[PDB]
Amino acid sequence: KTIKVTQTKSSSHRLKNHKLCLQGLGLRRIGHTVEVQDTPSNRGMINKVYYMVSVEE
Amino acid sequence: STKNGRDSNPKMLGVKVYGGQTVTAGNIIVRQRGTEFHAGANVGMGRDHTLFATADGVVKFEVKGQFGRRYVKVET
RNA sequence: UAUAAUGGGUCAGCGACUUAUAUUCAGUAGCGAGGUUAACCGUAUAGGGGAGCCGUAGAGAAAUCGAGUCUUAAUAGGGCG
RNA sequence: CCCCGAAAGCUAUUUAGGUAGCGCCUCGGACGAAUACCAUAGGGGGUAGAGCACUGUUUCGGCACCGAUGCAAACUCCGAAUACCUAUGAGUACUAUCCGGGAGACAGACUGCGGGUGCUAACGUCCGUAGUCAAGAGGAAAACAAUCCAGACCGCCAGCUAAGGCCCCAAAAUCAUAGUUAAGUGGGAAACGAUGUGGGAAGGCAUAGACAGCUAUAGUCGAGUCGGCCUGCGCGGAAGAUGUAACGGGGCUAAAACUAUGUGCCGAAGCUGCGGAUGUAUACUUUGUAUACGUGGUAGGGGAGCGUUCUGUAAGCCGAUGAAGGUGUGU
RNA sequence: CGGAGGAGUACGAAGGUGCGCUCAGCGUGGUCGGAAAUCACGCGUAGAGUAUAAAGGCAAAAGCGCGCUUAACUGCGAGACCCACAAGUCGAGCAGGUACGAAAGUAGGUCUUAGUGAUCCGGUGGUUCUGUAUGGAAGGGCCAUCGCUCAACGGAUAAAAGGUACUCUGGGGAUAACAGGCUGAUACCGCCCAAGAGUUCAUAUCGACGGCGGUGUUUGGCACCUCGAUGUCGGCUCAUCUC
RNA sequence: GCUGGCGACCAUAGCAAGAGUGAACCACCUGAUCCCUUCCCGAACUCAGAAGUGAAACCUCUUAGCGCUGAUGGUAGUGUGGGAUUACCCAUGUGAGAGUAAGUCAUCGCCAGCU
């Protein structure tokens, strides 16, 4: 139902839509962890920034 | 010296309203130099081959006829 | 720009967004469909002085009309209100 | 002192280092979900690639056609990924939009990707696109705006990490396992040349005796031998002017080099811990208390203050039991 | 100051409408008449044409004829495209008058995209506007229209070429000449393959056609440093390094 | 079950080759008085009709002969992140064109007339 997403790298130099995906997931800094619903809409944002997040199911 | 160096101003042609969008009578749908698209139901043709809506509805693109022409129409 | 680009040998003193008028916007105070006097008079920051100005109606080049008016053969349509 | 924060573009200009409108910044007001990210659904294309059906161009055959075979920014029978437009939807976010006050700017630079130009030259020049600098400190790269990691409110002799590293200069493994190199290769370079050394696949001949040498195919001799292919790491090709000067240095060879795998650790102004300040919002239905999110900054915009001279308050208050000024100390 | 071409027009029909028609090429035959004129029949075929450059188009052909005609109208115009402004573009539909069709209908120039010039100042035709005491008039306004190779084409004036080594000021390393820097086309040096030359014999010595590098001397490219100054071609004196 | 008219669809549907049909319909056909027609022509268009024919044409059937359709798998390209710079490699997502196997001698709607 819900998964935990942790930000592992900086977002300062990433693409605009990638920063917007992090913001739309709710992550704010390196090491921040959020708990979000497991829906395809959220998973799209997660998969777009797969390279700087870590997911715990 | 060179004998080249000229060009004309842009003309901004192209599709203005895509399939599935809602239009109001008079809205321009396609700007085109020739008849790349042809006018279907509820679509009119201007003197410079512009395609425009003559009724309120939803735009639809299709291919029909013996010549395989591209048509655009407005469904009410 | 460490730059081998400019300026300064050092100290003390002086040295550069002002003033008048008009106008627009914001804040604040008085009065409020009204607000306000100018020159001037005045044992004079008072009190007088309503000429004038701004607001309260617009349309049209204008004559003209006026919550309408212009365009037009049109009461249609349309533009400014 | 606090908050926000650009641009070096488009269009026009006796214009090109000026200026104006628009784009980009800031402040006030109005209005709230109308906005964005992502997921589904609908849509057009003529690029990358490819192809020869048109237009050109090309080679070899056969009798302009026919058959095999190539090429194209201004060719197309075809044709993506992305990007762009629209609708619906979850979650997250002070998002979009409109009306006004004030601007600055209109010399850009480098790097990656797609290109024109140039010699597939230039730290060259002109566009598109993204990042950084500009206007941005910290750590790595010897030193090094534009590369990598990362965005500095203040304090701490606390902890964890990123890039990058762990023999000494100099913080952390002279750590573990298995191989390769002998060139200080590592720590600059090509066509080409060569029994350098690892690994792999296949082939030829051979104890009715193979290769080399030896004796004039026979003959002693008693195991492997011969020639290519693929691939890892090395060698030569390799000449310059102040002084080793092409690992930063010392030094390094079962490495302190290279390849693969695994345990730890060091490492930033990043993250966490403790203390303090400040801005915005939400609630307390006064507050000055809690929670959440912020506080790098040039040109600029906005907000809040400290001191100096003079006027009133002031015929007041302080002053020869010592004012202003000067010079130390403490707070 | 990249690669290639066009425009500064034309047409009262080459516009509107109703009706009608398909090109080009080739092969056969047929007087002059053939490569190619015109006639007849067939085969596969848009390869023709579209006033003009190219592109996008063109069977209800947008290509080609005939008859009648003036919609190459007047007042407008929902709604859009494009856009700094000024401008530019498409447009269903309403009213009046009209043309061609039996009619449903079609027509607000031409298949489209170039064929162009703001404002000021004046000229001409209209006009129920204005008219400096009053009635007129002059002049002005409104509607339609005329005069620019203002081509440096958003057009500074109605009206304008040169010299300065006799020179001067404000600026720029935003921008040239010297030297430095980046680069190495060019320059110089080296190597690979080897037809051939050398009485025979590529390699004693040379070495065609081609290929790969090095250096930073030359001629150059760029414009990064210096224009609030880095101030010289050669000679003299004195040198120091590379191979 | 055949014939005609009007559509849907626009090659798996078309082209080519062979074959078949005259009861009705259709087509060829007879004539040029009147309507109407030829930049000349009753060829076309038009009118008045039934002596002939299914020849031509149109329709229907058969054939994979040309054409058209066309997988699976692989290759090229490509968004994001990383590594390299003749421009490729890795992770992940996506994925042609050509060619190969193979398929195709269409499929439907309304009206009217015959047997």
The Å distance, CA of A35 to C1' of F40, is 96
The secondary structure of chain B in percent helix, strand, coil, rounded to multiples of 5, reads 0, 40, 60
Q: How far is CA B28 from CA A19, B35, B72, in A?
A: 37, 15, 12
Residue from A15, A16, A6, A20 nearest A52 by CA:
A6
- The resolution of the experimental structure, rounded to one decimal in Å, is 2.2
- Residue whose structure tokens are 């022409």: B69
The Å distance, CA of B68 to C1' of D65, is 32
Backbone angles phi, psi at A18, to 5 degrees: -70, -45
Contacts of B64 (CB under 8 A, 6+ apart): B71
Sorted by where each begins, the domain ranges of chain A are 1-56
**Can you say how many angstroms the Cα of residue B7 is from the centroid of all Cα atoms in its chain?**
25
Q: What angle do CA B54, B55, B56 make, to 5 degrees?
A: 140
B20 touches strand F (CB under 7 A): no
Strand E nucleotides, any atom under 7 Å from protein beta carbons: they are 1-6, 55-59, 62, 78-83, 89-92, 109-113
Contacts of A38 (CB under 8 A, 6+ apart): A1, A2, A3
What are the start-end ranges of the E strands in A1-57?
2-7, 33-37, 53-56
Amino acid at site B46? G
Smallest CA–C1' separation from B67, nucleotide: F10
Q: Assess contact for B39 and B46: CB atoms under 8 A.
A: no
Question: Which technique was the structure solved with, according to the deposited record?
Answer: cryo-EM
Smallest CA–C1' separation from B66, nucleotide: F10
